[PDB]
Amino acid sequence: VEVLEVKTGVDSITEVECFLTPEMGDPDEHLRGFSKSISISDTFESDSPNKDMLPCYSVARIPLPNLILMWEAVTLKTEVIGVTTLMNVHSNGQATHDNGAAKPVQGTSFHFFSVGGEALELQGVVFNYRTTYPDGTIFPKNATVQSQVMNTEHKAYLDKNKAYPVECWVPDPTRNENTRYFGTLTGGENVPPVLHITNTATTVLLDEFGVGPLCKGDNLYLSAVDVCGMFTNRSGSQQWRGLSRYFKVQLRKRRVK
Amino acid sequence: EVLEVKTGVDSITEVECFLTPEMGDPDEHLRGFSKSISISDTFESDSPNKDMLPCYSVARIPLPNLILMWEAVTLKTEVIGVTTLMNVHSNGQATHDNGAAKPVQGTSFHFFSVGGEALELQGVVFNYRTTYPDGTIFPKNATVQSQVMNTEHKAYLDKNKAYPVECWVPDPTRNENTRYFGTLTGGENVPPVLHITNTATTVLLDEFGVGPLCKGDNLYLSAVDVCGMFTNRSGSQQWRGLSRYFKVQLRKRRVK
Amino acid sequence: VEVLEVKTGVDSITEVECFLTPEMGDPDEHLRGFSKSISISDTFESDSPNKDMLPCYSVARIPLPNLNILMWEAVTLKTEVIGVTTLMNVHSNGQATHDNGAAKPVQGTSFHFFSVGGEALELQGVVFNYRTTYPDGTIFPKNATVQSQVMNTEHKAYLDKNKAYPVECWVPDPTRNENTRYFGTLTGGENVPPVLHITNTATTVLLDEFGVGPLCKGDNLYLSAVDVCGMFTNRSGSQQWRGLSRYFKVQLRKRRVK
Amino acid sequence: VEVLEVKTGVDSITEVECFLTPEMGDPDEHLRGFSKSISISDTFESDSPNKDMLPCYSVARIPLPNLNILMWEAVTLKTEVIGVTTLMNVHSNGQATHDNGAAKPVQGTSFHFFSVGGEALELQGVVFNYRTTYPDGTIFPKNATVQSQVMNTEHKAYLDKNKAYPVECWVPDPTRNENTRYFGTLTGGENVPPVLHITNTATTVLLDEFGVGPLCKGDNLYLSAVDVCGMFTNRSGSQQWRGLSRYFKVQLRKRRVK
Amino acid sequence: EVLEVKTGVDSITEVECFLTPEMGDPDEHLRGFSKSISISDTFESDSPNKDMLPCYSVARIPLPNLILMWEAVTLKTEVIGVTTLMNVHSNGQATHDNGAAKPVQGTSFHFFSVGGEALELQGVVFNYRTTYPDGTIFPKNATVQSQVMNTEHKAYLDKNKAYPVECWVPDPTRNENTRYFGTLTGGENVPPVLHITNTATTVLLDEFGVGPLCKGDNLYLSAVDVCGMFTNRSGSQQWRGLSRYFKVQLRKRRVK
Numbered sequence A: 001v002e003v004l005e006v007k008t009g010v011d012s013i014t015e016v017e018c019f020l021t022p023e024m025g026d027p028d029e030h031l032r033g034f035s036k037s038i039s040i041s042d043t044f045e046s047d048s049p050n051k052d053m054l055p056c057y058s059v060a061r062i063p064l065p066n067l068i069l070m071w072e073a074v075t076l077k078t079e080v081i082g083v084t085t086l087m088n089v090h091s092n093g094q095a096t097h098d099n100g101a102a103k104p105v106q107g108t109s110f111h112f113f114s115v116g117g118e119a120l121e122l123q124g125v126v127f128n129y130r131t132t133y134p135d136g137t138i139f140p141k142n143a144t145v146q147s148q149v150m151n152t153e154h155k156a157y158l159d160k161n162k163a164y165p166v167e168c169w170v171p172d173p174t175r176n177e178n179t180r181y182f183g184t185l186t187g188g189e190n191v192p193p194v195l196h197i198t199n200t201a202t203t204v205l206l207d208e209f210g211v212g213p214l215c216k217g218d219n220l221y222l223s224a225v226d227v228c229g230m231f232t233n234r235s236g237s238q239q240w241r242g243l244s245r246y247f248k249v250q251l252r253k254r255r256v257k
Numbered sequence B, E: 001e002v003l004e005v006k007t008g009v010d011s012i013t014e015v016e017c018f019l020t021p022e023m024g025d026p027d028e029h030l031r032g033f034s035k036s037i038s039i040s041d042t043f044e045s046d047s048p049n050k051d052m053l054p055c056y057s058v059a060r061i062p063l064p065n066l067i068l069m070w071e072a073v074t075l076k077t078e079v080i081g082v083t084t085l086m087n088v089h090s091n092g093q094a095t096h097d098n099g100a101a102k103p104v105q106g107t108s109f110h111f112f113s114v115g116g117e118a119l120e121l122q123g124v125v126f127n128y129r130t131t132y133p134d135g136t137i138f139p140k141n142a143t144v145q146s147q148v149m150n151t152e153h154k155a156y157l158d159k160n161k162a163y164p165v166e167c168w169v170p171d172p173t174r175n176e177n178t179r180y181f182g183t184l185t186g187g188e189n190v191p192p193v194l195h196i197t198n199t200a201t202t203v204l205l206d207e208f209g210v211g212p213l214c215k216g217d218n219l220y221l222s223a224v225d226v227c228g229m230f231t232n233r234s235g236s237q238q239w240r241g242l243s244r245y246f247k248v249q250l251r252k253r254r255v256k
Numbered sequence C, D: 001v002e003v004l005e006v007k008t009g010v011d012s013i014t015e016v017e018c019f020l021t022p023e024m025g026d027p028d029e030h031l032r033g034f035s036k037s038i039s040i041s042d043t044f045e046s047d048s049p050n051k052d053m054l055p056c057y058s059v060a061r062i063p064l065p066n067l068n069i070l071m072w073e074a075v076t077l078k079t080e081v082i083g084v085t086t087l088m089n090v091h092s093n094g095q096a097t098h099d100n101g102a103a104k105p106v107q108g109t110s111f112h113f114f115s116v117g118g119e120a121l122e123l124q125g126v127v128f129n130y131r132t133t134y135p136d137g138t139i140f141p142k143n144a145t146v147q148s149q150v151m152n153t154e155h156k157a158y159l160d161k162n163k164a165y166p167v168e169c170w171v172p173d174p175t176r177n178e179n180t181r182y183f184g185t186l187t188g189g190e191n192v193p194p195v196l197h198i199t200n201t202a203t204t205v206l207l208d209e210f211g212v213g214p215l216c217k218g219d220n221l222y223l224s225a226v227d228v229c230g231m232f233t234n235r236s237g238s239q240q241w242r243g244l245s246r247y248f249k250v251q252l253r254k255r256r257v258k
Ligand SMILES: CC(=O)N[C@H]1[C@H](O[C@H]2[C@@H](O)[C@@H](CO)O[C@@H](O[C@H]3[C@H](O)[C@@H](O)[C@H](O)O[C@@H]3CO)[C@@H]2O)O[C@H](CO)[C@@H](O[C@@H]2O[C@H](CO[C@]3(C(=O)O)C[C@H](O)[C@@H](NC(C)=O)[C@H]([C@H](O)[C@H](O)CO)O3)[C@H](O)[C@H](O)[C@H]2O)[C@@H]1O
Pocket: A027, A031, A034, A035, A036, A037, A092, A233, A234, A235, A236, A237, A239, E041, E042, E043
């Protein structure tokens, strides 16, 4: 519970570097990074999305050098990987007008990443409490009408990949003391992706007392969502498209009592 | 007269809570939504029903009993459930043949305040002939001048689910003991832009280093988070709101 | 004016707090804060807007406590647009955006402007179309020529009267106004969304690069504003400007001059 | 030049204040500030714009008080687009946005540019379409080849004449202009809304990383501008560029050199 | 082992150049444009022609022959010919009856890098069954995983007119000796926003005060400036690119 001094010297720092692949639904063997085409329910009550149509949170647990000392995460560099793929406007999309190029990926996006010393803590909130979330996903159980705004029963850990749908979970702001998270939802069928890349930007993960996430059990938890928008097919059907996210985290050894 | 800050383990406290949105809640299935919006045929016949009108949210939070007063110093705040807006499959209006449903979008109002007493309101109406319904508190004796400024319309945000958003704003002539922040983004097609993080803190101290001072040991939190409108298959539209998280740090302050 | 030292002590500071109502045209007894429906001229040459169709600059001259050499110096401003949430009334004789939808909200061209000075705001006249006939009861650029469409230095005036100076044919004169601080944004386009921020935590400092604010000649403070938020479209499709009031709070201190 | 110390004393500073009028084409005696209606050629090969359809760079060479070794050094700039509120004239024979609506406001592609230098702005020619035939009375890239569509180093010029250098075929040469500070933004798209800010509280410092402003050769200051605000759409749907004048205020100090 | 910077005469140098865009150049009159964009008949049959594919630009600049190494410290950069997008009078598609031509708009990628060796690339494809054309260098043995991340796709940007923009990005796992900056703005109607000035400088030093160190006395500059698409009268669309200016200041640094 008590945080003491940082250890210095040769052995005292380490670095984690990896990428998290997006989990958009992957409806067949050719469509890694895409969801199933989105269909609309016949009535509000009958909302019942298939699993392959639901983007999910990505998570990786990274083992750290075995070490009371704990690894403290201090800085992060992060980047969406493959932003230029959205320039492919020639692959059986929907022409914007007669003889025009294909409509590029656009519309509702969620870009989110977190670094923590334990699993990201989630709070469940649903657009429509009568939505039936599908077998194979982990979703708010015993949803009530109050779950449309806040039901404190819906607590969970982001402890599994391809499992927690993006639309029914958010980071729990009442918890997550040992995690730093950042996200933006940009909503609207025509919103343009705006994706920046650079290897010169660093986020500092230290809190107001100068303490970063402390890695319980010598594990680092990285989480992400990068739903870039929707690809529209020639027919007008639409699929979520996601991209991978790069993480580089620097850690240092911190003594605790 | 504000004197010194108390120190010691006993001298700080924290409030953590959420305010649910008050969008109208037209039936047992529609918490967080308004009634579908209908348009009056004339200004004179504008008479919105209560469940069609988003209202201000407010909570009065009792603090440990204490001349000392609790002083609100910092705020962390967050809109809860931003990702619900990715549900584009729930009997909405397809954007084009075979496409996904139109997402929630259009006019938004995102607002929050922290004070040591009720938020002070000034009434202003789009149309003075609008008749606000029973069960709401609204500018009384509205005149055509109420469309721009009528100083008679003063109130306190002292009741949840009662003060309609569209006819009240924070009174800039008062609110010395409150800090408030809001943004109205208009237009039927404006995209929600909702940021979340647990790394952002707002300092509530004024230019003299003094934060809101909690009269009778009560903290007042207020919010509006109308995110936009949901469009049904039929084309009818309902406001959709989300809850707001507040975490406030307070310290004891001696006053004269 | 040679500016010398600031006075201190309890008597040395004062504060002005008020609001300026918008002057959008007010075409009937039910339409305060709106203009008349906008009509388009048959030809460029025949442009001839009626008074109730033209938003005008707002101005207030606030007398300050008498001093006399001392002048009141305006140091800080807090300001806010009043009634931003009125724009959420999309249920009141508007035009549905699509079948069964809500009304189109106020949107399109906006001008948000405010100034604080120790004398009247100085104006330069510029016209979109020099053959526009501005109406009786307004004060407009006189003897307009084709050069008035870009810059004609004859068109100088003072913002010295309310409901009088149309917004479209006057701007702050950047060649003058040394004793005023002004700020404005024109956001064009027929569909631009209003973005209106409110807070009581923001202050603007009015001091120039030498540490001197507007000095109030004859102990009067001049506040000016325009807050055209956009156009309201009614059910027939006709459009009217909609404006809102602006709050001002200004802190002043006594400054000796020679 | 070796740059040495700045002179002090009352005589050591001077100010320049002026405005540059826009040069949009001026197709007739009533249309100062506008271009001719814009037409579209059938092929790249057949592109042949009329002179009065082409906006041009504006330039003023301002003589300064005679010095001779001392040179005037430009230190600060205040600048403002003049007449931003003219864009609120949406009643002057424009095209209704929809039935009973107000006229479509000026919008679409804009270029806002200004520069301050101690010699003429240096230009590099680049063309959208090398087969464009530029008209008599303009100065344009000569001997254009297909490489001129991306970069042909033959097209060097000085902005040394008003109403002459079309905006679309010239830019500031980033390989030169050491003795000039320039700033510009092109915002494209047929529906981009103008966003025009005005204030008299904003100053740009013109000093480089070594603390040295433009040094005025022969005691002349060179000011250049373009303010294409967008296009005006007439009732018929024809479109014309609309520009506005730009105010400059420059502070200069005396600098010794060798 | 990076040691001290040399000072004095001949201890600094400057590189100035421009990189032309490589958009495909489909004929002798269309330098700076791509071929008209065609849409494949099926997802599987995606097979873009070379002249339809913008590529990364690169230049290797020899430095004064020099252990000392040239260290890149600052960059000034600018897109050249921004005003060409005001040509809305040639061979375009009127935005409405009697209107000017639709200007260049839609998807853009603006990117630049400075390094002391070739930019390192990671391949990522929109569609793994896309057949990239002869004469381009593209991710080989692409699998479905290549749609998100296949670590087999590594390359150096070591050739002009060869690496298509759409299937390569800077590799964030490498490039320790390069500084790179890019923005993808997607959507068919996005307006170009192009700023020019000679007053902005980017500093190339890392968190330790060390800039790119130029191996073999070569400086590597890379760029893409796809500004958007030009629409012809027929509605067919072509990518349009512009050149990029670079000015880099370098100093001599001793190393062990
Ligand atoms: C290849 C294709 O996209 N086929 C479409 C088909 O397209 C034809 C149609 O537009 C006709 C109309 O005239 O024109 C044909 O092309 C002609 C061309 O215009 C003409 O100039 C030339 O001379 O001749 C040709 C003749 O061939 C078009 O080929 O339209 C139908 C009806 O809209 C589509 O059927 C629907 O298929 C659905 C599943 O298929 C897709 C899809 O959703 O569209 C195909 C996508 O390519 C695929 N995308 C990806 C990234 O994999 C998606 C995706 O796998 C899933 O959605 C994932 O969930 O599948 C679905 O079965 C629906 O029920 C059918 O109506 C047909 O696809």
